[PDB]
C-alpha cells in the first residue's frame, strides 16, 4: 500500500495511500463528532472537534489536488503518443 | 442512524445524527418552555430554561457549521473531476 | 398554599404564604382597632394596640421586601439568556 | 397553541404561546390595576398589585429575549445556505 | 435505466441515470421549500431545507462534469477517425 | 404558482413562490407598523411588531439565498455547454 | 377610559386612568385646602386634610412608579427589534 | 403617506410615516416643555410631561431601528446581486 | 423566427431566437432598473431586480455558448472538404 | 455530579452543580422563610433570614453568570469551525 | 428662544429656555436670600423663601434630566449610522 | 439618459442612469450634512440623515454590483469570439 | 461679597454671604453675653440676650441647610454627566 | 471647506467638515471647562459645561461613523474593479 | 497647563487642569480640618469646613466623570478604526 | 500624623488625625467623668463635665461624617474605572 | 480610417481603428487615473474609474482577438495557394 | 508535546499544546468552582474564581483563533498545488 | 466559630460570630427583663436593664450592618464576571 | 510578588499583588472585627472598625475593577489575531 | 511621471504614479502617527489618525488592484500571439 | 525606531513604535499601581490611577487596530500576486 | 543560499530563500508560542504574539503565491517547445 515513482503505482493507489495513511484520524472524527452530537456544550470537546475536522478537510483537498495533478500529466503525456 | 467516514452516509444523515443524537433535550426545552410560559417567576425554573437554550442554540449552531463544511469538501472535490 | 424552593412557585405564592402565614394577627388588629376606636382610655387596650400594630407593620415590610429580592433575582437571570 | 421542537411552528407561535400560557394573571393585573386606581391607600391591594406587575415585567422580559434568541439562530442557519 | 460500460448507453441515457437515481431526493426539496416559502422561522425545518439544497446542488454539478468528461473522451476518439 | 424540481418552472417563479407563500404576513406586518406608528408605547403591539418583523427579515434572506444558489448551479451548467 | 393589557391602550392612557379613577378625592381635597386656609383651627378639618394629603400623595407616587415601569418594559422590548 | 410591503416605497417613506403618524404627540409635548419650563412645581404638569416625554423616546428609538432592521435587509439583498 | 435542425437556418438566425424567446424578459428588466434608479431602498424591487439580472446574465451566457459551439461545428466540417 | 475541564460534562450539568453544592441552604432558607411568615419580630428570625437570602441571591447570580460565560466561549469556538 | 420638535434647535437651545422661561423666580429668590442673610427671624420671609429654594431646585432637577434624556435619545440615533 | 436592452447604450450609460436617477437625494443628504455639521443634537436631523446616508450607501452599492455584473457578462462574451 | 443667580459665585461666597450680611447681629451677641458673665441678673440684659441668641441660632440653621441643598443640587447636575 | 456628493471631496474633507461646522463650540466647551475648573460649585456653570460636553462627544461619534461608513463603501467599489 | 480642544492635550492634562485650578481650595481644606481636628466645637469653623468639604467632594466627582466620559469617547472612536 | 490633600494618605490616617488632635481632652473628660463619679453634686464640675461631654460627642460625629464622605467619594472615582 | 470588407485595408488598419473609434474614452480614463492618484477617497471618482477601466479592458480584449481571428483566416487561405 | 515551525507537527498537536501548557490552571480552576458552589459568599474566594475563569476564557479564545489562522494558512497553501 | 479574612468562611459564619461572641450578654438581658417584668420599680434593675438594653440594639445594629455591607462586596465582585 | 509592563506577569499575579501589597490591614480587621464581636460599645473601637471596613471594601472593589479592566484588554488583542 | 494610454509607459510607472500622485498624505500619516504614539488620547489626533489611515488603506487597494487588471490585460494579449 | 511608510520598517516595527513611544506612561502607572496596592483610599492617588489606565488601555487598543489594518492591507496586496 | 535570474537555480531553491531569509522570525514566534501557552494573560506578550503571527502567515502566503507563478511560467514555456 505504499506508492514510490517507480515502474508500478495506480491513481486508485494514490487514493488509498492518502486513505489509509491517515486512518486513525477519521476514527478519531467519527467518535468526537459522536461525542459533540450528545452533547454540545464541553469546550475541550469543541476544541478536539474543530482540529480533527480542520485536519480531515485539509486531507481531502491535497488528496483531490494531488489526483487532479497527476491525471493532468499523464493525460498530457499520452497526446505526445502522436 | 450512525455515520462512520466509510462507504455510504450523507448530509441529511448529518442533519438526523445531529437531531437524534441530541432529542431529549429538545423535549426537556419543550416543557421547560411550557411551564416557564405558565409562571415566569421561579428561579430553579429559570436557570433550567437558561442551560437548556444555551444548549440548544449551541447544537444548532455546529450543525449547521459541519453540515456546511461538509458541503464545502464535496463541492470541492466535484470541481476536480475535470 | 406552602413555598419552596423547588420546581413550582411564583411571587403571589410568596404574598399569599406572607398574608395567609401571618392571618389571626391580622383579625386580632382589626378587633383592637374597634374596641379601640369605641373607647381610647384603656391602658391593656393600647397595650395590645400597639404591639399588633408594630407587628403588622413588621409584616408588611417584610413581605416587601422578599417579593423585591425575589424579582431583582429574577429580572437579573432573564437578562442572561443573551 | 402548543409549541415544541418538531416540525411546524414559528415565532408569531411563540409568542401567542407566551401570551395564552399566562393570561389569567393580565385580567388579574388589569382588575388590580382598576381597583388601584380607584382607592391608592389599601395595603392588601398594593401588595397584590406589586406581585401582579413584577410578574408582568418578567413575562414580558423572558418573551422578548426567547424571541430574539430564536430569530437569531434562524438567521445563523440561513446564512450557512451559501 | 441503468448504466454499465458496455455496448449500449448514451449521454441522455446518463442524464437520466443522474435525475431517477435522485428522484426521491427532489420531491423532498420541493416539499421542503414549499414549507419555507410558508413560515421561514422553524429551525428544524431550516436545517433540513439547507441539508437537501446542498445535495441537490452537487448531484447538478457532479452530472454536468460527468457528461462533460463523457462527450470530451467522445469527441477525442472521432478525431481518430482519420 | 408551485415550483416542482421537474420540466417547467423559473427563477422569477422562485420569487413569486416566496411572495405568494408569505402573503398574509406581509398584510399582518402592515397592520402592525401601521398601528405602532400611531403609539409606540402598548406591549403587545410592540411584540407582535417585533415577531413579524423578525419573520419578514427571514423570509427575504432565504428568498435572496435561494434565488442566488440556483442562480450559480444554472450557471456551473451553462459553463460545461463547451 | 378604561386600559386593559389588550391591543390598544397608551401611556398617557394610563396617566388618564390615574387621573380620573381618582377624581373626587382631588376636588375634596381643594375643598379641605381652601377650608384649612380659612381658619387652621379646627383638628376635625385637621384629620380631614391630613387624610386627603396623604392619599393625594400616595396616588401621585403610584402613578409616576407605573408610568415609569411601562416605561421601561416598552424600552426593553423595543431595543429587542435588531 | 402610508406605507404596504408593496411594489413602492421607501427609507425617508417610513421615517416620514413614523413623524406623522406620531404628530400631535410632538405638538402635545412642546407645550408641556413650554408650561414646565414657566413653572416646575405643578404635579400635573409633571406628570403629563414625564408620559410625553418617555413616549417620544420610545418613539425615536423605535423608528431609529426599524430603520436599521431595514437597511440591513436591503443591503444583504443587494449582495446577492453577484 | 423558428429555428429547426432541417434544411434552412443561421447563426444570426440562432441570435434572433435567443432574443425574441427571451423579449418579455428585457422590457421587465429595463423598467426594474428604471425604478430601482428612482429609490434603491425598496426590498421587493430589490429581488425582482435580483432575479431580473441574474436571469439576463444566464440568457446572454447561454446564447454565447450555442453561437461558439455551432460555428465550431461548421468549421469542423467545412474543413473536411479536402 | 461532580464537574472538572476534562473529557465529558454539559451547562446543565454546572446548574446542577450549582443546585446540589448548595442544597442545605435551600432548606434552611425555606424553613426560615416560613418562621417568618409565622412570626415577622423576632430579630433573631430576621438576621438569619437577612443571611440566608442574601447568600441565595449570591448564589443565583454567581452560577447564571456562570452559565452565561461558559455559552459564550463555546459559541465562540464554534463560529471557528469555518 | 422658544423650542419646537422640528427642524432646528440644540442642547444649549434646551438650557436657555429653561433658564429663561424661569427667570423672575431666580431675582426673587436672589432678594429673598439677601433679606433672609440680614435678619433670619421673619417667618413670611421664611415661607417666601423655603418656596422659591424649593421652585428652584425642582427646576434644577427637570433640567438637568431633560437634558439627558435628549442626549441619550441622539447617541442612540447615531450609533444607528451604521 | 435612458437604458434599455437594445442596440446601443454603455457602462459610463449605466453609471449616468444610476447618478441622474438618484439626484435629488444627494442634494437632500447634502443639506443633512451641513445641518449635522451645524449642531449635531437635533433628533429630527438625526434621523433624516441617518435615512438619506443609508440610502446613499444602498445605492453606491447597488450601481457598482451592475456595473460589475455587466462588465463580466461582456468580457465573457467577447472570448467566444475565438 | 453678594450673590446672584448668575455667572459666577460659589458655595463660600454663600457662606460669606450669610456672615456678613449678618455681621453686626454678632458684635451685638459678643457684648450681650460679656454683660451677661458680669452680672446675670438685670432682666432687660436677660430679655437682650434671649432674643440675640435666638436669632443667632436662626442664622447658623439657615446658613447651613442652604448650603446643603445647593450642595444636593450640584452633586445632582454633576452626575448627569455621563 | 464645503462638501457636496460631486466630482470632488475626501474623507479628509469629511473631517474638516465636521470639525469647521462645529468650532465656536468647542471655544465654548474649553472656555466652560476652564471655568469649572476654577469652582466646580456654581449650577449654572455645571448646566452648560454638560450640554456642551454632550453635544462634543455626540459630534465626536457622528464624524467617526460617517467616515466609517463613506470608507467601507469605498472599499467595496474598489473590489469591484476586478 | 491649559486645555483647549485642539492639537495637543491628553487625559493626565485634564486631571493636572482640575487640580491646579482649584487649588488653593485644597490648602484652606487642609488647614480647616487641622483646626477642626484641634477644637470641634466652634460653629464657624464647622461651617467653613461643611463648605470645604462639599465643594472637594463636588470637585473630585466632576473630574472622574469628565475622565471617563473623555475615555468613552477615546475608545469609541479607536474602535472605527476597523 | 498630619494630612495634605497630597500624593499620600488614608483613611485610618484621618481617624488617627481626628484622634490625636483632640487627645488632652478625651483625658480631661475621663478624669471629670471619675470626679464625677465620686461626688455628683459639684456644680462646677458638672458644668465641666457637660461641656467635656458635648465637645466630645461633637468630635465623634465630625469625624465619622467626614470618613463617611470621603469613602464614598473614593467608591465614586473607582467605580470610573470601567 | 474606415475599414470595409472591400478591396483595401489590413491589419494594422483594424488597430488602428480599434483605437480611433475608441479614443475620448482613452483620455477620459487618463484623467479619471489622474484625479485618483491625487485622492483615492471620492465614490463618485471610483465609480466613473470602474467604469472607465473595465471598458478600456474590454476595448483591448475584442481588439485583440479580433485581430488573431483574422490572422489565422489569412493564414487559412495562403496555405491553400498549393 | 512541543512544538516547533520545522517538518513535522500538526494542528491536533497545537491543541495538546495549549491544554497542556495551561493544565494546572484547569485544575485550580475545578477547585475553586467546587469551593463556589459549596458557599459563594467569601470575598477572597470570589476574587480567585473571577481571576481563574477570566484566564480560562482568555485560553480558550487564543487556542481557537491561533487553530483558525492556521487552517487559514495551510488551506491557502494547498490551493496553490494548481 | 471564628472568622478570618482567609480561604474560608460565610456569611451565616458572620452572623454566628456576633451571636456567639456576645451570648451572656442576651442571658443577662433574659433576666433583667424578667426581674423587671416582676417589679418595675427598682432602680439598680432599671439601670443594668437600659445598660443591657442599649447594648444589645448597638450589636444588632452592628450586625445587620456588616453583613449588608459584605453582601454589597460580594454582589460588586460578582457582577464583574463578565 | 512585583508586578511591571514588562514581559512577564499575570491576572492571578495582579490579584496576589492587591492582596499582599494589603495585607496587614486585614489582620487589623479581623483584630478589630474580633475585639467588636466583643464588646459592640467602645466608640475608639467603632470608628477604628468603620475605617478598616471602609478601606477593604475599596480595595475590593479597585482590585475587582482593574482585572476585569485588564482581561478586556486581553480579550481584545486576542481577537485582533484574525 | 505622468502616465497615458499612449506609446509608452510601464507597470512600474503605474505604481510610481500611485505613490506620488498620493505622497503628502503619507508624511501626513507618518506624523500623525508619531504624535499619536506620543499620547494616544487626544481624539482631534484621533480622527486624523483615522481618516488618514482609511485613506492610506484604500489608495494601497486601488493601486494593487489596477496593477493586477493591467497585468491581466497584458497576459491575455500575449497569449494571442500565436 | 521611527517609522515611516518609505523603502523599510515592519509589523513589529510598529508594535516597538507603539511600546517606545509610550515608555514613561508604563513606568508611571506601574508605580501608581504599587502605590495603589499599597493603601487604596487616597482620591488623588485614584485619580491618577483612573487617568493612567484608561490611557493605557487606549494605547492597546489602537496598537492592536492599527496592527491588523495593515496585516489585512499587506494580506491583500499578497493575494494580488496571482 | 541566493536567488538570482541567471543560469541556475530552482523552485526548492526559491522556497529555501523564503525560509532561510526568514528564519529568526520562526524561533520567535515558536518562543512567544510557548510563553503564551503559558500565561495567556500578559498583554505585551498578546500584541508580540499578534504581530509575529501575521508577518508568519504572510510569509508563507508570499511564498507560495511565489512558487505558484513561477512554475505557471515554466509550465508555459515548456508546451511551446511544439
Not at 492518502?18 to 469543541?46: C, I, Y
Request: charged share 20%.
Amino acid at each position: 500500500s505504499v506508492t514510490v515513482p517507480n515502474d508500478d503505482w495506480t491513481l486508485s493507489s494514490l487514493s488509498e495511500t492518502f486513505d489509509d495513511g491517515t486512518q486513525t484520524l477519521q476514527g478519531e472524527l467519527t467518535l468526537a463528532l459522536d461525542k459533540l452530537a450528545k452533547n454540545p456544550s464541553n469546550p475541550q470537546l469543541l476544541a478536539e472537534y474543530q482540529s480533527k475536522l480542520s485536519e480531515y478537510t485539509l486531507y481531502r483537498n491535497a488528496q483531490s489536488n494531488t489526483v487532479k495533478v497527476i491525471k493532468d500529466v499523464d493525460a498530457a503525456i499520452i497526446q505526445n503518443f502522436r
